[PDB]
Structures are given as C-alpha cells and as structure tokens.
C-alpha cells in the first residue's frame, strides 16, 4: 500500500525492502480481528453465552474495544518505562558492598564447578 510508504516517511526510513508493508498490514489485520472478536464476546456478556438463554445482537461501542485491548496489553506491547520499579529494585541490588579485593594483575575466574571447561561434549 502506498499509504504505508507515506507512513514510513514519518520516521526517515526510505530504504524498505517491499516485504515489510505486506507483513505489517497482515499483522494489523490479525491483531484487529482478535481484538474486535473478544470485544464482541464482551458485548454478548453485557447482554444477559450459555446453551440457549437469549439472543446475540451487536452494537460494539468503544468501551468493549478498550476492554479487549487492555487484556492484550496485559501480556504484550512494551509498556511505559517502568522507572520506579527499576529504581527501587536496583537500590535493593545497589546495597551490598563490592568485594574490595586484589587478584594481583591477571583475571580472576569463578571457581571450577562454576566455570565451563568447554571440552568436546561426550557421554
């Protein structure tokens, strides 16, 4: 799609390979199918389905779509930078002292039985 090239133009990336637009459009189709599918399930849920209790009539307001998307981003879609979590977590790590030692001009390795000894693997 030419409009996908137009959207590429926003990020200064005019060097595509022409498989990307097919692929990303396929992707968005898949994604929105799933989205407005489970939103339709939730529109059914407000319409109180089981093995025969009532009908199924579709409106699909925006709230249902919002629900169907928040569930997806519950386990996907790299969220806002979780800075505070990382700050406190890293303060918990950044708490116990350095070793304050001298291996005296070499490399200090972990002890063997934590080192690997990359021999030819064998039974």
């Amino acid at each position: 799609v030419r409009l996908l090239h137009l959207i590429f133009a926003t990020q200064n990336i005019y060097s595509y390979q022409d498989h990307v637009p097919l692929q990303l459009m396929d992707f968005a189709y898949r994604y929105t199918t799933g989205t407005l599918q489970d939103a339709t399930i939730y529109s059914d849920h407000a319409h109180a389905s089981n093995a025969g209790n009532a009908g199924t009539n579709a409106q699909l307001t925006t709230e249902d779509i919002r629900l169907a998307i928040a569930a997806r981003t519950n386990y996907q879609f790299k969220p806002v930078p979780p800075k505070e979590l990382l700050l406190e977590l890293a303060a918990e790590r950044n708490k116990k002292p350095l070793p304050a030692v001298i291996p005296t001009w070499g490399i200090r390795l972990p002890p063997e039985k934590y080192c690997l000894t990359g021999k030819d693997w064998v039974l």
Binding site: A91, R93, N94, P99, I102, R108, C115
Partner: protein, 522 residues
C-alpha cells in the same frame, strides 16, 4: 529557557537546605574545569588493581634495566653486560634489608639466573642466606659495602643512560641512581644531571604538542551479505574480531597465521567462535590480551580464552538484548548495555552482577568507562546521556541535546571530555563538570555516526560514519586550551572519503596512525 531558571530557583527556594547564598553557586554549573595535564611516568607513580571504594618498585626498576639494555644497539652490549649483576645484587640486598625477606628470596631465585656464566660460587654465597641477622652475621657483603667496586665505562653512554632514568621515576629510577651514587659513581652528580634535565625542560622539551594530521590503514570486509554488526581491533594491533548476525565470531590475524593452540591437538589465520544463540552486537578484548568478551541479543555475556580459543564462562543477569560490553581500563571489571532500559556492571570472577544502574526512559545503546575506571557513561535513544558511580549506582550527571538517538561514545585521556555521536549526525563534545557541551562539531552530512575516538594525548579526535566518510576533527579550537596554529562549520581539519563503504570503527595505535574497519567494498 528562562522558565527553567524560574522553576529550578523556586524549587531550590523550597529546599530548606538551599538558601539564597549557595543556590547561586548551584547556578555555577557553567564554569568548566581548568586545563589539566596528563600523568606522565616522570613523577606520579602507578596504582594497584583494586576496587573503586577507598613494595616492588625495585623489581620494576630492575625490569627497566634488563629491558632498555637488550633493546639497545649492538655496540653497547659488551659494556652494560657488566652493569647488570652488581646493581642486581645491590637492589637485592636493599630490599632484603628493607623488610621483605620473602620477596627478596622470590625475586632472588627468579633473577638468580641473570649472570650464572660469570659468577659461579656467588649464587651459593647468597643462597645460604634467608634472614636479616643471617646477613648481619655474613661478612662478604659487609666488606663489599665497605669499599666500592670499580667500573670501566665511557662518558656519553652513561650520559644517555642516566638521561633515560630521569624520564621514568614512576616504577623506579630514583632508587637505582641513589644506590649508584651511593656505591660506585664510576646523588650530587645525579642532582647536577637532574638540573640538566630541567634545563632541557627550558625550551628543549616540547611544550605544546600541537595537532598532527593522522595516517590511516583501512580494512574493508568483503563477502558478508550485510551479516555483520561490529568490529573491534586489538591493543597491540594484531587481531580484528567481527561479530556476525548469526552467533559467530571470526577472529582474524593480521600479519600471518600464528593462530594455533598451545595444546597437542587442534591443528588459516581465521578462528571462528561458537557458543552463542542470537546475533552479536558488541565484542571487547582484555588489556592483558589473552581473553575475550562478547555480548548478544540472547541475554548472555560470554568469556573466551585466547591460548586455546575456547569458552570458559557464561553470564546471565539481563532481561533483554545486550548491545555493547566493555572492559575496565585495568581489567577485572566489565560492563554491559541493553534494551531493558538498565545497565549492569560485572566482575569476571563472580557470575551474577555486582551493581545495576537504572535511569533511562528507553534503551541504553552504549556504555563506556572514564580513564580512572570509577565512572560509567550510558547513552540512549531517549536523546540523553548519563554518568554513574559504580559503587553508588546512581547518576552523578546528565547531558541533554542531540535531537535524535545516540550510538557511540568516547573519553579523552585526561578527564574532561566525552564524545556523543548519534543519528542527528552532529558530533557533540561534552565537559563532565559543566554538563553543557563545550563544542558542537558540525559536519558529516545527514547520516548516523557509528564510531569515533580520541588521540593518545587528546590533541585530536576522529569521527567515523555511515555517510561513507571519515572526518578528522581538531578539538582545541575554542576549548580551555585554545591551540589554533593558523596559517558547515569549523573544527574540521580534513575528510577522507571511501569507495562507497560505510565505516564502523577506528583504533588509534600507539603511534600517529589510525586503523579502520568498514564493509561493502564497492
């Protein structure tokens, strides 16, 4: 602009331990550092490998004596061969009396095999002595120190010899000249010669060391189908390692094929490393140069030997791709940068990280260590740069500008200067104390800048980019040391174009020249 001054001054007004007096000193973040000097090994001694949280100089002086001699001309061998043994036994007596008899024994039987063809009983003379009172009872050394020893030698040879032991009073020249003017004189003449060296300091020693336009040698890597991310060059400039995009590391040997293990098995000069899952994005060498480190996108960091070309260790504390891994300038400690918006500082002995640094609202593209090895500079795609105390964890300074990302960073050897290179294509030189860029080098068309580097002495830097060009920049055009040396913007000495090759790195050698690495051929 002025709104920021307004808001930060209101802030500091609310901070009760920030009165009006010192708040203005807080506004003195626009005076930079003074021009300082590089610690030559004339006065300032070495330091030991240690932690960032706060003998044998005799041995190193003798190492100087045995190195500078053999590296001399052939005419001067038959005379300094006899200058070797007496000062050796002299310094051994000095240390064994100083209070390190064990050390005395160890460097004795280490350097007892110095003059074994001349002296035959003296090794037995000095082998049957361990303790200090065992010396005080021993008589041959007492009569030895009583009189002096004759020494046959010319004049200009001892002149130039002393004039070599004046420039290196760091790991020991003073003790040896002191022992000489004590015993032989073949420090009064030593003091006169020190004054002569000071006279050399008056206009005979170079003052400025102004700019010096560089030589280059290029290394274009053909036949890769763009499956290649990083290069890196060695320390003594013998190898060049490239990290591919299918978990492969293809060590190359410059000048021959000596790449063979020390073993009996494993029977050309290109060595391939396996042991990885994902693409490789950064590689770094050991300054002792018998080891190698390599990060990837499979959240591994890995260690290799170089006398068997073999892995030893794996490392895992990261939640996402690791971009660049760099050692300390001294060794022992290494650091990594990732897409998890955090950076971890490792050791090499312990397998899980020591410290974790978290201040980026996006991915930490690059990591580097300041020359003291007690600071780390992260730079990111959030259009900001940061500095960290390895012990503290938390960010001492933040630098902001550079509309666009960041990709590479550099540090000038003397401790004032860091280089920001990003997609914006404008090199920015930053001052750590100011937090404000001293200079804004403009050039390089409109393309990403992948790599860059400074000199041996901070006189010159080099950028290196994706606009198929390298660009030497002077750095001291408007800084606190305005070296000008007279007859798009300035601070631009020269640009060397390439045959449609994006360039990926550099490595200033010890000497004048650079050493480059690019791809794509034609």
């Amino acid at each position: 602009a002025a709104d920021l001054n307004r808001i930060v001054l209101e802030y500091l007004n609310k901070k009760g331990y920030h009165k009006t007096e010192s708040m203005l000193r807080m506004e003195s973040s626009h005076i930079p550092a003074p021009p300082t000097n590089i610690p030559t090994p004339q006065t300032t001694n070495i330091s030991r490998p240690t932690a960032p949280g706060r003998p044998a100089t005799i041995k190193r002086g003798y190492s100087i004596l045995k190195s500078w001699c053999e590296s001399s001309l052939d005419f001067y061998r038959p005379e300094l061969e006899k200058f070797l043994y007496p000062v050796f036994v002299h310094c051994y007596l000095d240390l064994i009396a100083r209070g390190y008899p064990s050390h005395a024994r160890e460097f004795y039987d280490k350097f007892s095999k110095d003059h074994s063809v001349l002296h035959e009983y003296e090794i037995s003379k000095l082998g049957g002595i361990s303790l200090k009172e065992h010396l005080q009872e021993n008589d041959v050394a007492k009569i030895f120190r009583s009189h002096k020893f004759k020494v046959l030698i010319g004049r200009t040879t001892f002149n130039l010899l002393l004039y070599f032991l004046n420039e290196n009073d760091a790991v020991g020249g003073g003790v040896v000249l002191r022992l000489i003017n004590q015993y032989i004189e073949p420090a009064q003449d030593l003091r006169n010669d020190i004054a002569m060296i000071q006279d050399s300091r008056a206009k005979i020693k170079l003052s400025a060391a102004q700019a010096s336009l560089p030589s280059v040698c290029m290394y274009t890597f053909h036949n890769t189908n763009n499956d290649l991310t990083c290069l890196k060059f060695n320390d003594d400039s013998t190898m060049v390692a490239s990290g591919f995009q299918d978990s492969f590391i293809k060590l190359w040997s410059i000048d021959g094929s000596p790449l063979r293990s020390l073993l009996k098995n494993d029977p050309k000069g290109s060595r391939r490393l396996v042991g990885h899952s994902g693409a490789v994005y950064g590689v770094d060498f050991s300054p002792d140069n018998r080891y190698l480190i390599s990060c990837s996108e499979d959240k591994t960091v890995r260690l290799w030997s170089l006398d068997t070309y073999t892995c030893l260790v794996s490392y895992k504390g990261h939640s996402s791709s690791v971009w660049d891994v760099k050692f300390s300038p001294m060794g022992h400690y290494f650091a990594t940068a990732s897409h998890d918006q955090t950076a971890r500082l490792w050791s090499c002995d312990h397998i899980y990280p020591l410290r974790i640094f978290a201040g980026h609202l996006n991915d930490v593209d690059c990591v580097e260590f300041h020359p003291n090895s007690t600071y780390l500079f992260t730079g990111s795609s959030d259009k900001t740069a940061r500095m960290w105390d390895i012990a503290r964890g938390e960010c001492v300074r933040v630098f902001m500008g550079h509309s666009g990302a960041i990709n590479c960073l550099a540090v000038s050897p003397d401790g004032r200067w860091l280089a920001s290179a990003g997609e914006d294509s404008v090199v920015c030189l930053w001052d750590i104390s100011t937090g404000r860029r001293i200079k804004a080098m403009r050039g390089h068309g409109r393309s990403s800048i992948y790599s860059l580097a400074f000199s041996r002495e901070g006189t010159v830097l080099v950028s290196t980019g994706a606009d198929n060009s390298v660009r030497v920049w002077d750095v001291k055009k408007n800084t606190n040391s305005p070296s000008a040396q007279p007859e798009a913007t300035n601070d631009h000495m020269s640009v060397y174009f390439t045959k449609k090759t994006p360039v990926y790195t550099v490595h200033f050698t010890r000497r004048n020249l650079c050493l480059a690495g690019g791809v794509f051929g034609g």
